Symmetry: C8
Subunit: 184 residues, 8 copies
């Protein structure tokens, strides 16, 4: 049904209304099985109405999309390393027995694994446009089912804020916002 | 209502007036729940008037926007690391017992976390144009409701200064400035 | 046969149906004989139907493809090194015998090999379009046999999710998704 | 009023005069509250006169702007860091009590802050064009009120030198310069 | 003769057949005499047939080429170095004889050579198009003799998989693959 | 007056003459008050004459400018740093009093300033074109007053060599050079 | 005279012949007197013939060039350095005579030169096109005298393999190869 | 006068002759007074003659220029540095007098200068085109006086090899070379 709506008396006395219908953000288990990944499908409709002078020769653009935000970037690195046995002489006496072999340095003698995880402030708030298209005339107009979206390297919970926007060819714009959906 | 206004007698004797109406910069809790992020919605109208010779065949551009300034950039990094037990021989004697095992170096024996926060001078003062469009004739013209803006990696308070600008196709320009809004 | 299907009543009352037929993602032993490489062949058909007003003057785009996800990036590096024998004097006395040769540093005395493997979080979820083409009229339309796909530096299992997409010239879109195929 | 003026007998015997009127560079407290930032508003008019043969079919370009110079770049960085307690064994004996725990290295035991400020020779002298536009005919033409300008990372005093320039379509040019304005 | 063939009933009921004839991949001793280099000459023909409705007004693209894969990248570096004799005083006493010359550090006393070879996972599977050209009508069409191909920095054996591809202007595609040729 | 002149009998028997008149390179105290900056104003005229066959339908390009050279690049960097008091234990015994506090490392105990100046060979000899424009017919043509030029990071004296150039649409060219002006 | 030749029955039954005549690759002592540089002059002619249906309305491209290969890249670096005398106190006692001057570190006391030569695997096999031009009709067509080629940073001998190529506008191609010329 | 000449019977039986006349490369003391810089002025004429069928409707390109080569790149860097007096405690006992002040590290106690010069193999052989222009008809055509050229960072002597080139619109080319001029 109708999720949300906003109206604007524009700069040439037209009433511009933009609406969001049937919005669904469907979070799924990530294809990559990566705990830092989020993945979802966006369905919904954007509609517009224009009333007042010139209503029928209205030219504009209609968009549907979402903003996304999460607090931290996270990366994880795991290293395996091994180095074959060796010796270098360090502060050794090579003039007489045992020729500096009483003062050697070796590499690490065993194979080893190390892990390193980095957490930093996130990339901020981003905007995705599911569609952005030309419309004309007083009413319309556009619907989407099962558009795909994803983000990775994310931690602390991913929030998605759906919007619909109408921009008049004339410069005027109104956008309506919905309640956010939690991908965590 | 009318927020602010400015007039200019231009280079061919036209009086150019640009105005800001109904301005609202609405700071909200950030979608990304990041203390270094600020997020807001811009509403307002820009109007112009042109008087004197040629008024009716005026060609121009109308803009509405804001400048943003904050004093410091801030970044935060937290690292978790652990390395598997190992030894290397350092200045050891491999000719006789105990074959240098009386002088070893190991990696850190425990898992460890470290935090690093960097504060530096900020990126200076930036300008955003919420809309910038062609206008013609003596009066107009353009309105916006709930346009979105954001910035991250910011500290010490974010200030937003709203403006409206009129540029004549002829080169002349006047811009009016409003009272700043505090996002912190 | 028919694998999967989805319908949408669009923004101007047309019923848009997109379908996936005969889908085969054929994983093969990799040409490069690299355990971090995966390689496959994509076959299938995408069909569409449009019903309701204007059905016959429908303009659109039809795509067939897949998303790919795997959890980890992996890289492996093996180094062989050898350095010719040398000495430098370190904290040596050059005023008297044996002129500092009782305190030398050498390079590693033997040839050596070392291995280093790095595992990190993967690149997230990617989309590939096997074909994306213009279609017009009420029904169609497009088939592919043995298109090639590949990815390398991958670990933890590669998953492929096939889709078909129909985008109306009018902005409306519907995409249908199939059951994923395992390349590991 | 008239601030400054310059004339040139050009390459085809036209007298070209360019003038600066009503120039004001208004330094303000920086929106970003950053001591390395300067911010100002430029108002003024540029006029031109062309006399001699062909005066009425003169084609050219008119500009108004300023050069900016300051002696030093300055940046400031403040780091906070803390690392969780740890030990590695350094030149320790692991064959017998106390197993090398008599020779350990730790990280810094306390949290710490460090500051680093860098001062270097500045970026040199830069030119900003407030407007740059086509003019035609013997007289004109162009005015600006409250154009915005800023610079950051600056130290040692910021000077602004206003100019007006006329370039004939024919190649000839004259520019007039004003007295500089101090932003510190 | 005919090496391999594949057919497809396309999205508008045309039968599309693509074929590979007379394929020869001729591996030669590399011009650069570099053991990490492979070099070869590709000869062959691609043909196509289209049957069913509209056969004679078929528009498309014909390609011939190969995929290449090898498991490892390899690089080798050899350094020669020598440094002229010198001394620095390290932890020396300059208040009394012999003024710290009893505790010096020198550079390496001899000339030296070191070798370093790096082996890492390879670049994955790549595609080369020997030709890719427009065709029209029901049958054709294109042949190549002695086209050149090469790759360097390769180890573990280089495999080359020949293909021919037909893409209809309409989106449909079929590609046929041959048996791979070993460049090692 | 006339500064300098050069003539060329070109490839189709036209005599091409290019001349420099009234040349002034006016060095001023730098706007940025930076000892590594030089700043100046260029005034002058370039004239051409063409004689012989086709003189009146001559098409060309006329330029006026200078080359600049200085021997050294110079940069200066001054750092202020301070680090808060801390300790780490280095080769300490943590099994018994005083728990390694008899062997600590600290950061620098005082605030500190350091200066670093780098002198290197300069960027070589550069060419600036004050104007470069199309001319037609047997005589002309172009004049400039108070064009601006600058350079920074310079040491050892900045030299400016003025020139005028005429390029025929036919490829032929002649350039005349003046006596250099010293900006140091 | 005729150096080499190759024929192909193409995809529409035309016999395509490409030929190399009078080929000379003239190695000279390098202008830069650099032992890692090679320099040469290429002379030769490329001819084509087309027989069978449509021979006279043949459209194509004719090229002449060479491939170049050498086994190793080589670079050489020589550094001169000197540092003015200095001291720092290292593990010194500043509470009592001689105030740590019994334990100083200095820089290198003498001026010094060091040389570093790096040999690595070469850049592989490259192709240069001396000319590549449009041809039409049954026979032609193109000749070159003393075209220049060069390469630097090369070691182990530079080999040049001359070719001529004919590409039909229809996609078909044949290339003929000559005996290689040694630039070392 | 005539310096050098070369002729070619081209691919369509035209005799193509290209010539160099009046060539002068005038080395001067470098404007930048930099010993690694070379600077010169190029004067000369290129002529061409075409004989045989179609001579009068010949279309082509005429160039005049030089190759440049020198064996070494050279760079020089001089650093001045000073650091204000400081102390850190190294392996000090802070539990009892004198609290680790018996084991300190300082920065260098004096101001210091260091020089570093790097010599490496040169950039190879480069080509400059003084002019490159369209010509038509059987004879011409183009002359240059006092064109400027320069290079810096050079050592071991700079050689300049003058050439003239004629390229037929048809692909054919001949170039003639002169005796080299020494800029050292």
């Amino acid at each position: 049904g109708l999720d949300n709506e906003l109206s604007l008396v524009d700069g040439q006395d037209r009433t511009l209304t933009v609406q969001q219908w049937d919005t669904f953000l469907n979070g799924v288990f990530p294809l990559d099985r990566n705990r830092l990944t989020r993945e979802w499908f966006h369905s919904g409709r954007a509609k517009y109405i224009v009333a007042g002078p010139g209503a029928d020769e209205f030219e504009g653009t209609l968009e549907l999309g979402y903003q996304i935000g999460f607090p931290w970037s996270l990366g994880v690195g795991i290293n395996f390393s091994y180095t074959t046995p060796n010796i270098l002489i360090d502060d050794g006496d090579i003039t007489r027995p045992p020729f500096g072999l009483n003062s050697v340095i070796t590499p690490n003698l065993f194979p080893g694994v190390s892990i390193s995880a980095d957490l930093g402030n996130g990339p901020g708030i981003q905007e995705v446009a599911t569609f952005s298209v030309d419309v004309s005339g007083a009413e319309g107009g556009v619907a989407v089912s099962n558009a795909h979206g994803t983000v990775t390297g994310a931690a602390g919970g991913v929030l998605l804020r759906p919007f619909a926007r109408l921009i008049a060819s004339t410069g005027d714009s109104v956008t309506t916002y919905g309640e956010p959906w939690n991908m965590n």
